[PDB]
Every structure is written in structure tokens, then in C-alpha cells.
């Protein structure tokens, strides 16, 4: 199967809302070893976001039910654990694609930042589901991926770039939800918003302004 | 225990993991005891979502296949993906249909249950008809129609016109006539008379069962849609 066939299949899969299929297609495309285009990496990103997202959403419902409770608790525990291993296997899939192919072949700063954010995101999803000794090590890998991406984005992208903004958003969420550092989360979110607002005049600014809206909503929610 | 499987099913439902939910309720059904009303609805909801994901996907890919004139390679791809999805959908329908034949219908000890399961048999043959190849289609359509018809006979004799399962059967059977049999006049008459019969006996509507009035509204929405 050549790359272009796989990418068209991935697009079919997307429209069918069959994201496992979509992920498998873009996994195999990535494994060919050629640097992905903007379109291709966005398809890889959307595919796995939906694949992991389903498990994350399920995990939240079941872990909550486990808290709100008997023999029902052991069942809810075991089901959470089943969902967790699915979730970990997906995260590790993505993370090894990032290490073996995506990050090394990333020829541009934009790309490097995109993939490092992605590395931060997927370690963060592991962090959500980690406990015991492992968690501190998982959280630090997330934070280092984000931090490197954060530095590169500050140096080489404008404040209104959607990838720079998107990074600010996710990194702020990392601080609030994983590190429980509300003040760092807010200051990071506020400066990203403010620096973007100050930028006068964005070429295709629909995505950028959407993230700005999400940044401010987070600020409103976190400030009571 | 049956009870543990049912609690797992409910947990799967909460997680929106419907394949798990379906697997649980399948094995409960396979224990051979008549399902409670709660268990019946869990099975139905489970498979509705399992089969529905494929139906929805099938409709998207089928639409793309027909809307692409130029690219013969893109059509061939869409076709092969349609067929992949079809075999998934057929296996689901066949599992449900075998559960209905082996366990659910023969053990149905009330008219309410038998109509429900017969309607369900009609629905899943209908879903097979949606995706059926020209040759096998006529036979699959007849199995769908016979299931619905028997369900329709029993509901007419045993159930009140305002009963949600009677109304629901009228809705689906009218949809069968319109979409599978291309018989809009039959579809409309079936829908109109079920609506009118419900309206005539509004006094015999029990306090528990909105459901009835929601389905009546759906019936009349189809009438006005199909009349235009
Ligand atoms: C730019 N915009 C964003 O990154 C919006 C982040 O929200 C994703 C919207 O979901 C669109 C449909 O996704 C279906 C698959 N499900 C998920 O991805 C999913 C499942 C459970 C929880 C979440 N996440 C959330 O509810 C909100 O999480 C945020 C919020 C802001 C930035 C990043 C995230 P995160 O990476 O999902 O933790 C997503
Ligand atoms: C009484 N009410 C009903 O029977 C409601 C029928 O509407 C079902 C809407 O389903 C949305 C929640 O289910 C999500 C999974 N998806 C599906 O089940 C699904 C997927 C594709 C198509 C459909 N069906 C439809 O869009 C409409 O089909 C109707 C309409 C009226 C009655 C029965 C049906 P049908 O048995 O699904 O073909 C459902």
C-alpha cells in the first residue's frame, strides 16, 4: 500500500467516524519513514485524539462511579483497569511513533513544536491514569515535552500562531489539572491571550481566535 | 450470575462502550431465562447503538461512492470499504436475529414482549434489507415484512392503541413501507390510522407512559413529510 492510498482511506475512515481504522491508516503512513505533510500529521492527530478520547471519556465516567459507591466497586475498579490498559496501549503507540519517526524527521520549527506538544499531550493522558511511583516520572516527561515546545514556539512563532496558542492552552491545562498549580496555569494562559490580543494585525485567524476564546474561558473558570 | 452481567451491561452503557454492553446482554440472553423488561431494553439499546454506528457509517461511505464519477480508484476504494462495513453490519444483525429465534421470541410469555421482539425481528431484517444485494433482497424484505405483520396482528388484538410499543411498531412498519417497499400510500395509511386510533382513545392512556405522545408526534411528522 502506497502512502497516497492510505491517506485517502484515512479520509474515508474519518467521514465514516471510524477512528480506529483512521488511526491504523495514519500509523502505517507514519511507519513508511517519510516526513509527514501538514495534512498528514493533522489526520494522524485527529485520528488518535478520537481513539484515545473515547477511552478517556469512558475512564472518567467509570472512575467517578467507582468513587460514588460493595461488589459493585470491585466491578467498577476492574472495568476501569481494562479501560486503562486500552488507554495506555494507545498512548504508547502514539508516543513511539513520535520518538521513532515524527520528532526526528521534523524539518521545521512549526513541526517540532507540533510534535512536542503531542508528546506532552499523550504523556499527560498517561498521567491522568497513573498512580504510585510511575506518576512522577510520567508527569515530568509530559512537562519536558511541553517546555521544549514552549521555548521553541516563543523563539520562532508569532503570538497569534495557532500552534503556539494551542500549546499555551494545553500546557496551561497541564499545570492546572496534572500539577495542580492554578497560579502558573492562569499566568501562562493570560500572557498567551494578552500577547495575541496585542498583535495587530493573523492570516487564517479562525483557529487562533478559537483558542484565544478557550484560553479566556479557562481563565474565567479558574478565577472565582 | 445473571445479575453481575446486567450490572456490567449498565456500566458499559454509562461508559458508552456499547460493544461491551451488547456482549454482556447477549450472554445473559443465552442463559435461556425470559428477560425482564429492564434487561430487554438494555439488550435493545445495546444493539441499536452497535448496529447504528455501522448503518451511519455505511450511509456516509455509500453516499461518497455514488457522488464520485471521475475517480475509478476512489470509487473502488469506497466500494471495498462499504463491503467491509456491510459484513460487520450483517454479522451484528445475524447475531441479534439468532438471539431472537433461539431465545427471545419462543420464551416471550406476554403479548407486550412478543410484539416487542417481533418488531425487533422486523427491524433487523430491515437493516439487512438496507444493505442487501439484488438477489437476496426480496427474501430478506419478506422476512422483515412477515415479522412486522405478525407483531402488528398481536398488538391490534392485545394492546391499547396508545401503547408505546404498538405506536412504535406502527412507526417502524410505516417506515418499512416507505423506505424498503417504496409504498408511500401504504406507509401513510398505516401511520395515519395508528395516529387517529391513538387520538380516539386518549382516555386509556396510563400515567406512566410522554412516550406515547412523542411517538404520535413522530408519526404525524412522517405524514406531513411524505404528503408534501
Ligand atoms: C483546540 N481545541 C481543543 O483542543 C479542544 C479540546 O477539546 C476536545 C473537543 O473534543 C472534540 C471531540 O473529541 C472526541 C474525543 N474525545 C476527546 O477528545 C475527549 C475526551 C475526554 C476529555 C476531553 N477533553 C476535554 O473535555 C477538555 O480537555 C482539554 C481542554 C483544552 C485543551 C486540551 C484538552 P485535552 O487534551 O482533551 O485534555 C476530550
Ligand atoms: C421511537 N423512536 C425511534 O425509533 C427513534 C429512531 O431514531 C433513532 C435515532 O438514533 C440516534 C441514537 O442512536 C445512535 C446510533 N445510531 C442509530 O441507531 C442510527 C443510525 C443511522 C440511522 C438511524 N435511524 C435514523 O436515522 C432514522 O430511522 C428511523 C426512524 C424512525 C423509526 C425507526 C428508524 P430506524 O429503525 O433506525 O431505521 C439510527
Swiss-Prot record, chain A:
Annotated InterPro entries: 14-3-3, 14-3-3_CS, 14-3-3_dom_sf, 14-3-3_domain
The keyword Phosphoprotein is annotated on this UniProt entry: yes
UniProt modified residues of type N6-acetyllysine: 3, 68
Entry GO MF terms: cadherin binding; DNA-binding transcription factor binding; identical protein binding; phosphoserine residue binding; protein domain specific binding; protein kinase binding; protein phosphatase binding; protein sequestering activity
Modified residues (Phosphoserine): 58, 181, 204
CDD domains: 14-3-3_beta_zeta
Alphabetical list of SMART domains matching this protein: 14_3_3
Modified sites of kind N-acetylmethionine: 1
Signal peptide: none
Top-level taxon: Eukaryota
Effect on the protein upon substituting residue 142 to L: Found in a patient with a neurodevelopmental disorder; uncertain significance
Keyword vocabulary terms for this entry: Acetylation, Cytoplasm, Host-virus interaction, Phosphoprotein
One CC-aspect GO term: cytoplasm
Subcellular location: Cytoplasm; Melanosome
PROSITE patterns referenced in this protein's UniProt entry, alphabetically: 1433_1, 1433_2
Xref: Pfam families: 14-3-3
Site (Interaction with phosphoserine on interacting protein) location in chain: 56, 124
Purpose: Adapter protein implicated in the regulation of a large spectrum of both general and specialized signaling pathways. Binds to a large number of partners, usually by recognition of a phosphoserine or phosphothreonine motif. Binding generally results in the modulation of the activity of the binding partner. Promotes cytosolic retention and inactivation of TFEB transcription factor by binding to phosphorylated TFEB. Induces ARHGEF7 activity on RAC1 as well as lamellipodia and membrane ruffle formation. In neurons, regulates spine maturation through the modulation of ARHGEF7 activity.
Protein family per UniProt: Belongs to the 14-3-3 family.
Protein name: 14-3-3 protein zeta/delta
Organism of derivation: Homo sapiens
Gene giving rise to this polypeptide: YWHAZ
From Swiss-Prot, chain B:
SUPFAM superfamilies assigned: 14-3-3 protein
InterPro entries: 14-3-3, 14-3-3_CS, 14-3-3_dom_sf, 14-3-3_domain
Gene3D superfamilies: 14-3-3 domain
Residues with the Phosphoserine modification: 57, 183, 206, 209
Main location (coarse class): cytoplasm
Record keywords: Acetylation, Cytoplasm, Host-virus interaction, Phosphoprotein
SMART domains: 14_3_3 (SM00101)
Biological process terms in GO annotation: angiogenesis; cellular response to glucose starvation; ERK1 and ERK2 cascade; establishment of Golgi localization; Golgi reassembly; lung development; negative regulation of apoptotic process; negative regulation of innate immune response
Domain of life according to the entry: Eukaryota
N6-acetyllysine PTM sites in chain numbering: 2, 67
Annotated site residue numbers, Interaction with phosphoserine on interacting protein: 55, 126
Matches recorded under Pfam families: 14-3-3
Record's GO cellular component terms: blood microparticle; cytoplasm; cytosol; extracellular exosome; extracellular space; focal adhesion; glutamatergic synapse; hippocampal mossy fiber to CA3 synapse
Role played: Adapter protein implicated in the regulation of a large spectrum of both general and specialized signaling pathways. Binds to a large number of partners, usually by recognition of a phosphoserine or phosphothreonine motif. Binding generally results in the modulation of the activity of the binding partner. Promotes cytosolic retention and inactivation of TFEB transcription factor by binding to phosphorylated TFEB. Induces ARHGEF7 activity on RAC1 as well as lamellipodia and membrane ruffle formation. In neurons, regulates spine maturation through the modulation of ARHGEF7 activity.
PANTHER family documented for this protein: 14-3-3 PROTEIN (PTHR18860)
Assigned protein family: Belongs to the 14-3-3 family.
Subunit details: Interacts with CDK16 and BSPRY. Interacts with WEE1 (C-terminal). Interacts with SAMSN1. Interacts with MLF1 (phosphorylated form); the interaction retains it in the cytoplasm. Interacts with Thr-phosphorylated ITGB2. Interacts with BCL2L11. Homodimer. Heterodimerizes with YWHAE. Homo- and heterodimerization is inhibited by phosphorylation on Ser-57. Interacts with FOXO4, NOXA1, SSH1 and ARHGEF2. Interacts with Pseudomonas aeruginosa exoS (unphosphorylated form). Interacts with BAX; the interaction occurs in the cytoplasm.
Name used for this protein in its record: 14-3-3 protein zeta/delta
Naturally occurring in which organism (per UniProt): Homo sapiens (Human)
Lineage of origin: Eukaryota, Metazoa, Chordata, Craniata, Vertebrata
Name of the gene encoding the protein in the UniProt record: YWHAZ
